[PDB]
Design an enzyme around this catalytic site. Structure first.
Site, short mmCIF file in Angstrom:
data_model
loop_
_atom_site.label_atom_id
_atom_site.label_comp_id
_atom_site.label_asym_id
_atom_site.label_seq_id
_atom_site.Cartn_x
_atom_site.Cartn_y
_atom_site.Cartn_z
N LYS A 129 -0.91 0.23 73.20
CA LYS A 129 0.44 0.76 73.07
C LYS A 129 1.21 0.47 74.35
CE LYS A 129 2.56 2.41 69.59
NZ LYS A 129 3.89 2.41 70.24
N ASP A 173 8.25 -1.39 67.63
CA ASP A 173 8.08 0.05 67.52
C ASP A 173 9.45 0.71 67.63
OD1 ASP A 173 5.19 1.62 67.65
OD2 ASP A 173 6.88 2.92 68.17
O1 LIG Z 1 2.00 -3.59 64.01
C1 LIG Z 1 1.46 -2.97 64.95
O2 LIG Z 1 0.72 -3.51 65.79
C2 LIG Z 1 1.73 -1.48 65.08
C3 LIG Z 1 2.78 -0.93 64.14
C4 LIG Z 1 3.19 0.47 64.51
O3 LIG Z 1 4.27 0.61 65.09
C5 LIG Z 1 2.27 1.66 64.20
O4 LIG Z 1 1.36 1.48 63.41
O5 LIG Z 1 2.48 2.75 64.75
#
Ligand SMILES: O=C(O)CCC(=O)C(=O)O
Ligand SMILES: NC(=O)C1=CN([C@@H]2O[C@H](COP(=O)(O)OP(=O)(O)OC[C@H]3O[C@@H](n4cnc5c(N)ncnc54)[C@H](OP(=O)(O)O)[C@@H]3O)[C@@H](O)[C@H]2O)C=CC1
Length: 416
Positions: free
Chosen positions: A102, A142
Site C-alpha cells: 500500500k 486508489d
Molecule cells: O488493484 C489493486 O492492486 C488494489 C485495488 C484496491 O484499491 C483495493 O483492493 O483496495
C-alpha cells in the site's frame, strides 16, 4: 482508534481458529518494509512544496507486493500499514502470486492543478523507485487516484528504468493505450456480483426477481447495481450517496439514476421514488445489501435492524467486529470485504500478467478467468466457514493466513 492496531487485533482474533506458530504470527503482525519519503514538487507560482509519501510492503512471501496509492489529506502511515496488511489477505484469499502492499501521499488533490498532479506523481515515482518494480511492488489506483495518474507514474518509471525490462508491469490500472487491460473499470463490481451469485447458490435462493439495495453510487456501487440488474436479474429498489438516498419498490434503472446524479450532483430528488436517508437504506427488506460507500456503516447499534439475507461488503470494512456476531446470530450470510471486492485486484493481476507477457487478452477471457477465480475463492471460504463452524470473515482469514504461512515456511523464514 488506530487502523493498524485494529487490523492487527482482527488478525489476532482470527488466529485462534488455526494452527499458526507464535513466531509466524509475530512476523505477520508487522510489515516487512516501510518507506517514508519527502515528495517535492514545484507549484504553479514557482514555489517548491514538500509532501509526505508512504509505501508499505507488509509481506512478499507469496510474490511481489500489490496495492494502490491513496492521495487523501487525512492519510496516515497507520492507515497505509493497515491497508497493506489487508491487501496481503486479499491477494492470498483469491490465490494470487502476490504480496500485500500500500502507498499514499498526504495531499489534498482538489487544490492541485493537472500540472501539479503530474509533478506529484512523477516525484512520488522518483522517490519510491528503489523499492518498486514489476517483480518487487506493483501499485494501482486508489482513493483520489485514477488511470491518468497511473499513466504518468508508469511513464516516469519507464524513463528511470531506461526501458530495460517491462515497464508496463510496474503499475496496474492504466489507460488501455499504454498496457491497460479490459474489464478494469467494472472489475470490483463484477467480482462482487460473482460472489453474490455464488452465495445465493450456497443458500439455495433464486436471484431472479429479488430486491437489492446498494449504498454509495460511484465506480463500485453504480456498477454493482447495474450488473446485479443486468446479469443476476435482480430488482434495484434503492441506491444512495453522500447526500441521501432514493427508494422505489417497483425498481430503478441504474443508467437513469446515474444520469440524474451527474446532472444534479446527487441521486436525491429522483422522480417516481421516495427520498430516504442513508441509515434507512440498510434496514430495508431486500435480498442483497451492498454497502459500497464507506467503512463502519453497520455497527452494534443498527446490526439488529438489518433484514437482508446477504450482505456484500464491496466497501473496505463496512461492518464492525461487534456487528459481525449479531449478524451471524440472525442467520445472515456475510461476504467478507477482502473477498467480496477482490475482483479489482484479480483484474489488476490479469493486467500485470498481460504486461509482463507482452500479450493482451479480450474482455471475454478476462471475464471468464475472473469468474473462475472468484468462484473458487468464495467456495473455499464458505466450505471453511461451514466445516469449522466459524464466521465467514474468520474463514477468509484462515484461508489467506494459511497460504501466507505456508509460503513463509517454504521460504524458510519461520521454522515452527
Ligand atoms: O488493484 C489493486 O492492486 C488494489 C485495488 C484496491 O484499491 C483495493 O483492493 O483496495
Ligand atoms: N476499484 C474500486 O472501486 C475499489 C472499491 N473498493 C471499495 O469501494 C468503496 C468505494 O469505491 P469507489 O466506488 O471507487 O469510490 P467513490 O468515492 O468513487 O464512490 C463511493 C461512493 O460512496 C458515496 N459516499 C461517500 N461518503 C459516503 C457516506 N458517508 N455515506 C454514504 N455514501 C457515501 C460517494 O458519494 P459521492 O460521490 O456523492 O461522494 C460515492 O457515490 C471504498 O470504500 C473502497 O474501499 C475496494 C477496492 C477497490
Amino acid at each position: 482508534i488506530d487502523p493498524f492496531e485494529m487490523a492487527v487485533k482482527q488478525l489476532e482474533r482470527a488466529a485462534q481458529y488455526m494452527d499458526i506458530s507464535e513466531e509466524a504470527l509475530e512476523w505477520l503482525k508487522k510489515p516487512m518494509r516501510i518507506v517514508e519519503v519527502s515528495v517535492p514538487i514545484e507549484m504553479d507560482d514557482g514555489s517548491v512544496k514538500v509532501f509526505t509519501g508512504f509505501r508499505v510492503q507488509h509481506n512478499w512471501a507469496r510474490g511481489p507486493t500489490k496495492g494502490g496509492i491513496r492521495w487523501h489529506p487525512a492519510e496516515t502511515l497507520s492507515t497505509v500499514k493497515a491497508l497493506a496488511t489487508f491487501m496481503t489477505w486479499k491477494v492470498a484469499v483469491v490465490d494470487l502470486p502476490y504480496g500485500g502492499g500500500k502507498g499514499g501521499i498526504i495531499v489534498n488533490p482538489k487544490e492541485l492543478s493537472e500540472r501539479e498532479q503530474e509533478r506529484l506523481a512523477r516525484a512520488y515515482i522518483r522517490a519510491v523507485y528503489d523499492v518498486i518494480g514489476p517483480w518487487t511492488d506493483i501499485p494501482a489506483p486508489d482513493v483520489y487516484t485514477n488511470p491518468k495518474i497511473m499513466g504518468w507514474m508508469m511513464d516516469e518509471y519507464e524513463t528511470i528504468m531506461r526501458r530495460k525490462g517491462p515497464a508496463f508491469g510496474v503499475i496496474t490500472g492504466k489507460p488501455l493505450s499504454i498496457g491497460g487491460s479490459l474489464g478494469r473499470g467494472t472489475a470490483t463490481a463484477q467480482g462482487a456480483i460473482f460472489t453474490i451469485r455464488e452465495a445465493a447458490k450456497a443458500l439455495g435462493i433464486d436471484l431472479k426477481g429479488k430486491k437489492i439495495a446498494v449504498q454509495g453510487y460511484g465506480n463500485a456501487g453504480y456498477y454493482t447495481a447495474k450488473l446485479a440488474k443486468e446479469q443476476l436479474g435482480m430488482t434495484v429498489v434503492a441506491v444512495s450517496d453522500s447526500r441521501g438516498g432514493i427508494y422505489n419498490p417497483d425498481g430503478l434503472d441504474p443508467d437513469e439514476v446515474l444520469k440524474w446524479k451527474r446532472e444534479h450532483g446527487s441521486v436525491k430528488d429522483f422522480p417516481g421514488a421516495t427520498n430516504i436517508t442513508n441509515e434507512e437504506l440498510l434496514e430495508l427488506e431486500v435480498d442483497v445489501l451492498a454497502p459500497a460507500a464507506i467503512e463502519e456503516v453497520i455497527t452494534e447499534k443498527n446490526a439488529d435492524n438489518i433484514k437482508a439475507k446477504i450482505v456484500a461488503e464491496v466497501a473496505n470494512g463496512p461492518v464492525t467486529p461487534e456487528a459481525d456476531d449479531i449478524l451471524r446470530e440472525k442467520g445472515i450470510l456475510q461476504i467478507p470485504d477482502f473477498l467480496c471486492n477482490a475482483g479489482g485486484v484479480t483484474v489488476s493481476y490479469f493486467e500485470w500478467v498481460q504486461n509482463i507477457n507482452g500479450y493482451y487478452w479480450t474482455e471475454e477471457e478476462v471475464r471468464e478467468k475472473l469468474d473462475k477465480k472468484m468462484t473458487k475463492a468464495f467456495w473455499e471460504v464458505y466450505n471453511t466457514h461451514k466445516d469449522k463452524n466459524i464466521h465467514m470473515r474468520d474463514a477468509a482469514y484462515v484461508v489467506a493466513v494459511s497460504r501466507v504461512y505456508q509460503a513463509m515456511k517454504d521460504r524458510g523464514w519461520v521454522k515452527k
